[PDB]
């Protein structure tokens, strides 16, 4: 049953790509002040779950949902900017830059590991196809 490794590692690659994309989106908007609806940008993060249907022992990984990060919104005193609060408290995203950079590095490394898994699995499948010949 080496074919299931294709599904497992492909799901892992897709999930890590989504995680890296979300981390990069958070990082690129660390300095944002406004959203499309006027709301401040809220740092977002993916949720990882075991991609196993009920009764399946072990599977790959899947992104359940994207959730707003739990952290206080960064308050900035700029009661001159057109966007402000009642007391001039501009709300800026709660992005922790170090966390996002480490997340990007971790996602890249896990991605590369899954690529190696896929490569060696394909090599083994070819060798198995050359069983008796």
């Amino acid at each position: 049953a080496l074919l299931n490794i294709f599904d497992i590692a492909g799901s892992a690659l897709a999930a890590q790509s989504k995680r890296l994309n979300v981390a990069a989106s958070n990082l690129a908007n660390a300095d944002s002040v406004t959203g499309p609806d006027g709301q401040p940008y809220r740092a977002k993060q993916v949720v990882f779950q075991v991609d196993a249907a009920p009764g399946q022992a072990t599977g790959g990984v899947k992104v359940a949902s994207v959730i707003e990060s739990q952290a206080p919104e960064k308050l900035v005193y700029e009661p001159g900017n057109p966007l402000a609060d009642a007391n001039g408290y501009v709300k800026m995203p709660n992005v922790d830059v170090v966390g996002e950079m480490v997340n990007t590095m971790s996602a890249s490394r896990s991605y590369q590991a899954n690529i190696e898994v896929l490569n060696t699995v394909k090599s083994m499948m070819l060798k198995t196809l050359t069983l008796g010949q």
């Binding site: 995680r19 981390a23 993060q45 993916v46 949720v47 990882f48 779950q49 075991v50 359940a64 959730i67 990060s69 922790d96 966390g99 996002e100 480490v102 997340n103 971790s106 996602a107």
Partner: peptide
């Protein structure tokens, strides 16, 4: 039950 991978789940969380 999984959870958020990486920075959020590897930093000391609040007590409750």
């Amino acid at each position: 039950p999984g959870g958020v991978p990486g920075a959020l789940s590897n930093q000391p969380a609040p007590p409750n």
